[PDB]
Design an enzyme around this catalytic site. Structure first.
Site, PDB file in Angstrom:
ATOM      1  N   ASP A 191      -8.312  20.637 -28.891  1.00  0.00           N
ATOM      2  CA  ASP A 191      -8.008  22.064 -28.912  1.00  0.00           C
ATOM      3  C   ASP A 191      -7.236  22.476 -27.650  1.00  0.00           C
ATOM      4  OD1 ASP A 191      -9.325  22.437 -31.472  1.00  0.00           O
ATOM      5  OD2 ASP A 191     -11.237  22.602 -30.417  1.00  0.00           O
TER       6      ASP A 191
ATOM      7  N   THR B  85      -8.890  28.517 -34.756  1.00  0.00           N
ATOM      8  CA  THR B  85      -9.453  28.232 -36.076  1.00  0.00           C
ATOM      9  C   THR B  85     -10.436  29.311 -36.504  1.00  0.00           C
ATOM     10  OG1 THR B  85     -11.379  26.984 -35.298  1.00  0.00           O
ATOM     11  CG2 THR B  85      -9.287  25.785 -35.540  1.00  0.00           C
ATOM     12  N   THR B  86     -11.381  29.598 -35.615  1.00  0.00           N
ATOM     13  CA  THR B  86     -12.432  30.572 -35.854  1.00  0.00           C
ATOM     14  C   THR B  86     -11.874  32.004 -35.868  1.00  0.00           C
ATOM     15  OG1 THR B  86     -13.654  29.066 -34.377  1.00  0.00           O
ATOM     16  CG2 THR B  86     -14.872  30.922 -35.338  1.00  0.00           C
TER      17      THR B  86
ATOM     18  N   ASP C  75     -15.533  23.851 -32.885  1.00  0.00           N
ATOM     19  CA  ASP C  75     -14.221  23.970 -33.547  1.00  0.00           C
ATOM     20  C   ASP C  75     -14.422  24.492 -34.964  1.00  0.00           C
ATOM     21  OD1 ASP C  75     -11.484  23.886 -32.910  1.00  0.00           O
ATOM     22  OD2 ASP C  75     -11.154  21.880 -33.672  1.00  0.00           O
TER      23      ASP C  75
HETATM   24  N1  LIG Z   1     -13.730  33.308 -20.136  1.00  0.00           N
HETATM   25  C1  LIG Z   1     -13.498  34.182 -21.140  1.00  0.00           C
HETATM   26  N2  LIG Z   1     -13.809  35.489 -20.990  1.00  0.00           N
HETATM   27  C2  LIG Z   1     -13.585  36.374 -21.979  1.00  0.00           C
HETATM   28  N3  LIG Z   1     -13.050  36.042 -23.171  1.00  0.00           N
HETATM   29  C3  LIG Z   1     -12.691  34.765 -23.458  1.00  0.00           C
HETATM   30  C4  LIG Z   1     -12.902  33.737 -22.426  1.00  0.00           C
HETATM   31  N4  LIG Z   1     -12.472  32.580 -22.955  1.00  0.00           N
HETATM   32  C5  LIG Z   1     -12.026  32.840 -24.210  1.00  0.00           C
HETATM   33  N5  LIG Z   1     -12.148  34.147 -24.513  1.00  0.00           N
HETATM   34  C6  LIG Z   1     -11.775  34.795 -25.803  1.00  0.00           C
HETATM   35  O1  LIG Z   1     -12.512  34.186 -26.866  1.00  0.00           O
HETATM   36  C7  LIG Z   1     -11.663  33.663 -27.885  1.00  0.00           C
HETATM   37  C8  LIG Z   1     -11.869  32.158 -27.979  1.00  0.00           C
HETATM   38  O2  LIG Z   1     -13.008  31.891 -28.793  1.00  0.00           O
HETATM   39  P1  LIG Z   1     -13.146  30.499 -29.582  1.00  0.00           P
HETATM   40  O3  LIG Z   1     -14.601  30.345 -29.952  1.00  0.00           O
HETATM   41  O4  LIG Z   1     -12.491  29.443 -28.724  1.00  0.00           O
HETATM   42  O5  LIG Z   1     -12.315  30.793 -30.941  1.00  0.00           O
HETATM   43  P2  LIG Z   1     -11.130  29.878 -31.552  1.00  0.00           P
HETATM   44  O6  LIG Z   1     -11.788  28.631 -32.070  1.00  0.00           O
HETATM   45  O7  LIG Z   1     -10.567  30.731 -32.654  1.00  0.00           O
HETATM   46  O8  LIG Z   1     -10.195  29.640 -30.397  1.00  0.00           O
HETATM   47  C9  LIG Z   1     -10.232  33.989 -27.504  1.00  0.00           C
HETATM   48  O9  LIG Z   1      -9.663  34.868 -28.485  1.00  0.00           O
HETATM   49  C10 LIG Z   1     -10.299  34.650 -26.135  1.00  0.00           C
HETATM   50  O10 LIG Z   1      -9.695  35.949 -26.167  1.00  0.00           O
HETATM   51  F1  BEF Z   2     -13.557  27.515 -32.245  1.00  0.00           F
HETATM   52 BE1  BEF Z   2     -12.027  27.211 -31.404  1.00  0.00          BE
HETATM   53  F2  BEF Z   2     -10.709  26.361 -32.211  1.00  0.00           F
HETATM   54  F3  BEF Z   2     -11.871  27.506 -29.673  1.00  0.00           F
END
Ligand SMILES: Nc1ncnc2c1ncn2[C@@H]1O[C@H](COP(=O)(O)OP(=O)(O)O)[C@@H](O)[C@H]1O
Ligand code: BEF
Ligand SMILES: Nc1ncnc2c1ncn2[C@@H]1O[C@H](COP(=O)(O)OP(=O)(O)O)[C@@H](O)[C@H]1O
Ligand code: BEF
Ligand SMILES: [Mg+2]
Lengths: 43, 78, 48, 518, 209
Positions: D384, D90-91, D57
């Site tokens: 989340d 968040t990221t 997170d």
């Molecule tokens: N199974 C998947 N295959 C491809 N892209 C994905 C998958 N799951 C999530 N994503 C992409 O990765 C991002 C999620 O990354 P994440 O580390 O959870 O960041 P955040 O903390 O900002 O949500 C999303 O913007 C989504 O588009």
């Molecule tokens: F790093 Be996250 F809020 F999926």
């Protein structure tokens, strides 16, 4: 594919490596205290 | 009995660890320390000890447990 | 398996050397699960 | 001629820009590895307490680590905001936040363009990226059948990047069931997240009913069947007194004995007033005095003590009861009912599991695992998931993730640049370039040629296949609708919004002034 | 397990790249204002001696200021080298030197390409940059008339960026005449440079004898 995709940052490679070591050491302190021929420790 | 080196892998706090031989011998040496003090006080031919408070004040005794209570003992196995 | 009394290769189930299934079922599962959460790590940084 | 006091720092224009940039980019370049499926976790450790946490997170990383650089502390907050306003993203917020500022230094230095003019261009792009977002939005109507399979996806997408990646399908159904069970309520207190150590991660579950971190009133029956419940707030051990100052002035000891038994009578009567309710289960936020605890036992009523404002509120929602005080007129207040309250064991601790309730509007998820950090993260990962899905109960539109969402905006922002022209044009294109830099790291963490893949997916979406996204296991361009990688509109709408604001605040900055620390 | 002795620093891959770039760029960026006609001068000053100097010669800056970043000191020497082998192009060397390295970091990070592949690519380009250079080159033959006017130009070009920009033409003939006068010797001890304080700058001269 001689050019390929270059792995940029190296801290990852060396942190994993140095965590395992730091961990294997604890598992190593214990090896003397397993089974019927195992020995006790005074803390 | 050269002072042992702290390991370069293991990470312990305000604390040191001696293993295997080094401890097994330390135990025995600290055990004789406590025992040898009161070997002079055994038997009818045994004699008594004079234990100074540090402020001069003292007690004279044979009773082994009363001697061992008085001696400040630092080691666990002691 | 190893029997301490026999000092070698001997039938341990018949030797009455016995441990619960749960003690091994959970033993491997936890270890293998922990390794998974140790290998997730790619950086350490010191927080407030 | 010096102006300020001592130990005061003045970083002006030329140097202020350096702090602004270097600070943001540093923070962005810290969380870049968190992003995406094949993304990795950080190990945070405080100097105080000897504590740590193994986290993804992005907020939990940024909110934790101390920082000095004001420009960094700006992005740190915008990360908290996103966690408050959406729960997820968040990221994504921070990286896009930085990459915009990275593309600004590149314009301010390499091109020599006024920051206010980059601001006046970033602004034109931001309202156009938010534009083509709504146009590409897929709102799901009355078909709750179509909408459930839609929500599950949201979870599956949210969860893959955390430890729960391997157990996505399982945890998605646990979250989806819990929020749909919450019956629209957007408050997360209703979902109790009890983490108990041990077993596998696949072993976590959502209970059909409620499990309570409490015990029975003493030697009382261990399992109640066909329950009926009164939920209470009234005093018991404290001994109810009229607040003011009721001091006993007994002329001679004789009247003290009577007045001692009087307080006992005041209780016996306050339990009889409750007895009249005709109820086998009494739960109370307050303590049950050693005396009333028995009065319930002799009568056969099961009595549970200490379940605070929290516990009580959920029980009232799961059992369908009422948070009751007074107890003077039982006819007017509403009881709670369930099927069985049997006390289970979970590894060591004794929990009373209400099972088969009247209305499921409050639930308990029990998380399991091998390590206290694994649990920590499962809760943080789960929050989340219970955020996006809870906020998509309010904001019911969807956008395809996997870099697709951010690409479709990169499209429209890039064509609006072929329309705007001037020196602003460059900053408009840059905005688009920065949006592209997100799928770039999604690809960089997995391992494939970031350059080639982003360049392959650009072509498709720009060519009008506005579904195309990143298959981050197979390293290919894959259909996001047909592979179920869906995300909340409210998520993506916040990300771009929040980030565009960060940019203008910092790009306006030209003088950093620090006063002598306390 | 620590390997090295104390006070010893280890800047490996991920951090060694930073230093190498931070250094080069930081130095390249220092002299950037020197370059060209409407270029500016730096005022360098020692802690030692209560001495200073107001300069353009990009070597003279780099040679002087202290630095720690080894990568920087690399470029600093490539500056002296140029001042040795040609005398001018001090700042032109350093900027092009850094601008290559800036452009590498943008490849090594943003794209993720191998440094050795960048090398085997910077190499093919260099041999092609030097190529066309000779094709576009204008060699001046037996016409010493056509070559003196040609020399006067080179100076006029070199000179414009120093304090001597304003009296370019003047100082250009004082150099051209002095070097021609030198009769094809390439040792500069033969031109004694006596600076005597006072008067105008346009008051400077090459004596006949
Ligand atoms: N199974 C998947 N295959 C491809 N892209 C994905 C998958 N799951 C999530 N994503 C992409 O990765 C991002 C999620 O990354 P994440 O580390 O959870 O960041 P955040 O903390 O900002 O949500 C999303 O913007 C989504 O588009
Ligand atoms: F790093 Be996250 F809020 F999926
Ligand atoms: N009058 C001029 N008009 C246009 N370009 C010029 C002029 N004088 C010098 N230059 C260019 O500027 C550069 C010389 O700048 P200078 O500060 O002397 O750097 P260096 O010390 O590296 O030669 C050369 O690239 C040359 O082409
Ligand atoms: F600044 Be230079 F050596 F013409
Ligand atoms: Mg020059």
């Amino acid at each position: 594919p001689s050019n390929a995709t270059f792995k940029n940052k190296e801290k990852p490679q060396e942190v994993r490596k140095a965590n395992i070591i730091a961990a294997r050491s604890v598992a190593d302190a214990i090896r003397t205290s397993l089974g019927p021929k195992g020995m006790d420790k005074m803390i | 009995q050269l002072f042992n080196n702290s390991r370069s892998d293991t990470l312990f706090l305000g604390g040191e660890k001696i293993s295997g031989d080094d401890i097994r011998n330390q135990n025995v040496l600290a055990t004789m320390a406590v025992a040898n003090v009161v070997k002079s006080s055994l038997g009818p031919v045994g004699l008594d000890k004079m234990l100074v408070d540090d402020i001069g004040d003292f007690t004279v005794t044979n009773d082994g447990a009363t001697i061992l209570s008085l001696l400040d003992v630092q080691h666990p196995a002691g | 398996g190893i029997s301490v009394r026999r000092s070698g290769t001997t039938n341990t189930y018949e030797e009455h050397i016995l441990q619960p299934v749960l003690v091994s079922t959970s033993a491997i599962t936890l270890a293998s699960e922990c390794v998974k959460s140790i290998l997730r790590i790619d950086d350490i940084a010191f927080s407030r | 001629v010096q102006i300020f006091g001592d130990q005061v720092t003045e970083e002006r224009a030329e140097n202020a820009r350096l702090s602004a940039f270097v600070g943001a980019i540093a923070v962005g370049d810290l969380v870049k590895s968190t992003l995406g499926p094949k993304g990795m976790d950080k190990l945070l450790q405080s100097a105080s307490s000897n504590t740590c946490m193994v986290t993804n997170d992005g907020a939990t990383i940024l909110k934790s680590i101390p920082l000095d650089n004001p420009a960094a502390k700006v992005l740190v907050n915008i990360s908290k905001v996103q966690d408050d306003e959406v729960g997820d993203g968040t990221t994504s917020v921070t990286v896009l936040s930085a990459e915009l500022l990275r593309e600004a230094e590149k314009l301010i230095d390499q091109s020599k363009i006024h920051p206010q003019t980059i601001i006046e261009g970033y602004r034109l792009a931001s309202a156009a990226a938010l534009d083509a977002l709504t146009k590409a939005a897929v709102d799901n109507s009355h078909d709750k059948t179509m909408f459930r399979e839609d929500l599950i996806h949201i979870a599956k997408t949210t969860l893959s990047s955390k430890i729960l990646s391997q157990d996505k399908d399982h945890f998605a159904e646990l979250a989806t069931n819990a929020i749909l069970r919450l019956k629209g309520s957007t408050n997360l207190e209703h979902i109790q997240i009890i983490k108990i150590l041990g077993g596998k991660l696949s072993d976590s579950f959502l209970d059909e009913g409620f499990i309570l971190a409490k015990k029975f009133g003493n030697n009382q029956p261990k399992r109640i069947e066909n329950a009926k419940i009164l939920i209470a707030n009234t005093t018991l051990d404290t001994d109810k007194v009229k607040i003011f100052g009721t001091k006993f002035k007994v002329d001679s000891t004789a009247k003290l004995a009577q007045l001692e038994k009087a307080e006992r009578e005041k209780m016996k009567n306050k339990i009889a007033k409750i007895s009249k309710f005709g109820i086998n289960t009494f739960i109370n936020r307050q303590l049950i005095y050693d005396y009333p605890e028995q009065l319930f036992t002799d009568l056969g009523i099961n009595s549970i003590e200490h379940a605070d404002f929290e516990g009580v509120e959920r029980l009232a929602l799961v059992t369908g009861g009422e948070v009751v005080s007074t107890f003077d007129e039982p006819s007017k207040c509403k009881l709670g009912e369930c099927d069985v309250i049997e006390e289970i064991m979970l590894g060591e601790q004794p929990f009373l599991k209400f099972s088969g309730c009247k209305a499921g509007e409050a639930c308990t998820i029990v998380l399991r695992g091998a390590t206290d950090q694994t649990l920590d993260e499962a809760e943080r990962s789960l929050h989340d998931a219970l955020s996006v899905l809870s906020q998509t109960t309010k904001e019911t539109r969807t956008v395809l993730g996997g870099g697709c969402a951010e690409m479709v905006m990169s499209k429209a922002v890039d064509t609006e640049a072929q329309n705007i022209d001037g020196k602003k044009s460059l900053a408009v294109e840059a905005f688009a370039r920065a949006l592209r830099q997100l799928p770039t790291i999604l690809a960089d963490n997995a391992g494939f040629d970031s350059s080639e893949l982003v360049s392959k997916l650009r072509s498709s979406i720009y060519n009008g296949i506005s579904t195309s996204g990143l298959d981050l296991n197979n390293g290919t361009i894959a259909d996001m609708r047909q592979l179920g990688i869906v995300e909340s509109y409210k998520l993506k709408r916040a990300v771009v919004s929040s980030a565009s604001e960060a940019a203008e605040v910092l790009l306006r900055v030209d003088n950093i002034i620090r006063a002598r620390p306390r």
